[PDB]
Design a protein around this ligand. Structure first.
Ligand SMILES: C=CCO[C@]1(C(=O)O)C[C@@H](O[C@]2(C(=O)O)C[C@@H](O[C@]3(C(=O)O)C[C@@H](O)[C@@H](O)[C@@H]([C@H](O)CO)O3)[C@@H](O)[C@@H]([C@H](O)CO)O2)[C@@H](O)[C@@H]([C@H](O)CO)O1
Ligand SMILES: [Mg+2]
Ligand SMILES: [Mg+2]
Ligand SMILES: [Zn+2]
Ligand SMILES: [Zn+2]
Ligand SMILES: [Zn+2]
Ligand SMILES: [Zn+2]
Lengths: 219, 215
């Protein structure tokens, strides 16, 4: 199976630099052009750059929006794609995807971005990294939740019982206020499984390397 | 500079119905040699990465349901979904690859369904938060339709600043929305009053849904 995994995303100050990376496998890396694409929260996809394959001599191209500021490159020995970003600004805040681009030299060639990574998030801001506080929300069925309050930057991840509980989960999009995000997550289970059975929310905040497990106890 | 534009910006369709969306390029994407149009369609579901649906304007990517069809040529292209399904909720992007790549602004497809009343739950501040001097009161309004909804916070009978709301994306299976409302107070302020009330007003009833607790 083809696999693409971005990394390198985090918080960076206005004017700063940051390099993203993209690990790939499941296909012959050098046969393919590779692209970076970004998407600011709530906005459209934006193609940024590509780097051609070996047959094309690995030449590069950029959108006018990042030309002269960003650099795309590839390490063919271990099949990595890179994006060096300099002179970053708020408008550059976004999730960045790497995508497998074309192979013109194949008879089966067709023109599209046929595989995408999960994306890595980038925030350009002077504001400080702040870990979340994670609070339990407890009162036929019963609804519980976790409040993930006052963190920066995005993102965080929330699971329930290590992902075992995934049905009847609602994670509400974060809301920014005074340089800090807050988000909540709800879960609904049968009244017979709580409190008689443990319910725990698991919260991670990569930028502060925070890992939290919070059990929901009645009260 | 190839400018890509899509239409409509958004729309809502009932399950089972046909959906049509448009994409325009500022110039032809047609290779005269091959007569291939360098126009692709991508689907992006809430919280997911973009996924290839159609390329060469009309070629369905392997694994894509038959209900998805791409057509058009030159500067005008269409994506058609027959029998839209609840899971089709997404933003759809067209993209030219004739000269580098350029995405359109996207079409947001939402799903129309029968009106559904919210299930409302209120939650008092946790003791762990109170210990640090803060006091957040949370209200969940889950599984309703349509999206439009009002939340009223009342403390000791008096409506209440300090309120932040957040709506989920539409649900992929039941096409409902949910919404969270958080009233953040200081502990000192929280301890001054007894009754905390979350009032939901939705078209599904003439009477507000009222959830509350006493401190
Ligand atoms: C004047 C004739 C040029 O070449 C073509 C033609 O019919 O126009 C196209 C050839 O296109 C390729 C190839 O090696 O197959 C691939 C091209 O790729 C890219 C690019 O690298 O910028 C990316 C694509 O997604 C697409 O945007 C195309 C453009 O639409 C232009 O084709 O560009 C590109 O790398 C060219 C390269 O410039 C050399 O032509 O090559 C190729 O099919 C030839 C054919 O082999 C001989 O006629 O026709
Ligand atoms: Mg493919
Ligand atoms: Mg739901
Ligand atoms: Zn060039
Ligand atoms: Zn295919
Ligand atoms: Zn008061
Ligand atoms: Zn009072």
């Amino acid at each position: 199976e083809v696999k693409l995994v971005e990394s390198g995303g985090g918080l960076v100050q206005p004017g700063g630099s940051l390099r993203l990376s993209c690990a790939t496998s499941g296909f012959t890396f050098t046969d393919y052009y590779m692209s970076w694409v970004r998407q600011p929260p709530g906005k459209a996809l934006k193609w940024l750059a590509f780097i051609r394959n070996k047959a094309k001599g690995y030449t590069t191209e950029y959108s006018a929006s990042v030309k002269g500021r960003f650099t795309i490159s590839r390490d063919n020995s271990q099949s990595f794609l890179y994006l060096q970003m300099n002179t970053l600004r708020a408008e550059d805040s976004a999730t960045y995807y790497c995508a497998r681009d074309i192979n013109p030299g194949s008879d089966g060639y067709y023109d599209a971005l046929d595989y995408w990574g999960q994306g890595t998030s980038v925030t350009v801001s002077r504001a400080k990294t702040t870990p979340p506080s994670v609070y339990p929300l407890a009162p036929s069925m019963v609804t519980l939740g976790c409040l993930v309050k006052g963190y920066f930057p995005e993102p965080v991840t929330v699971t329930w019982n290590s992902g075992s509980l995934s049905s009847g989960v609602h994670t509400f999009p974060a809301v920014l206020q005074s340089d800090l995000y807050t988000l909540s997550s709800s879960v609904t289970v049968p009244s017979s499984t709580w409190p008689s059975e443990t319910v725990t929310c698991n919260v991670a905040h990569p930028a502060s390397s925070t890992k939290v497990d919070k059990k929901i106890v009645p009260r | 500079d190839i400018v890509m534009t899509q239409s409509p910006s958004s729309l809502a369709v009932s399950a089972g119905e046909k959906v049509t969306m448009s994409c325009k390029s500022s110039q032809s994407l047609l290779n005269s040699r091959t007569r291939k149009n360098y126009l692709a369609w991508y689907q992006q579901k809430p919280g997911q990465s973009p996924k290839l649906l159609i390329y060469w304007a009309s070629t369905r990517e392997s694994g894509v349901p038959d209900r998805f069809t791409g057509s058009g040529s030159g500067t005008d292209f269409t994506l058609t979904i027959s029998s839209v399904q609840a899971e089709d909720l997404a933003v759809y992007y067209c993209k030219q690859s004739y000269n580098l790549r350029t995405f359109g602004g996207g079409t947001k497809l939402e799903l129309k369904r029968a009106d559904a009343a919210p299930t409302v739950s209120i939650f008092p501040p946790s003791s762990e938060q109170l210990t640090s001097g803060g006091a957040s009161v949370v209200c969940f309004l889950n599984n309703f339709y349509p999206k439009d909804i009002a939340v009223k916070w009342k403390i000791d009978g008096s409506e209440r600043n300090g309120v932040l709301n957040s709506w989920t994306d539409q649900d992929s299976k039941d096409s409902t929305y949910s919404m969270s409302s958080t009233l953040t107070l200081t502990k000192d302020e929280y301890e001054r009053h007894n009754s905390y009330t979350c009032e939901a007003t939705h078209k599904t009833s003439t009477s507000p849904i009222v959830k509350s607790f006493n401190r």
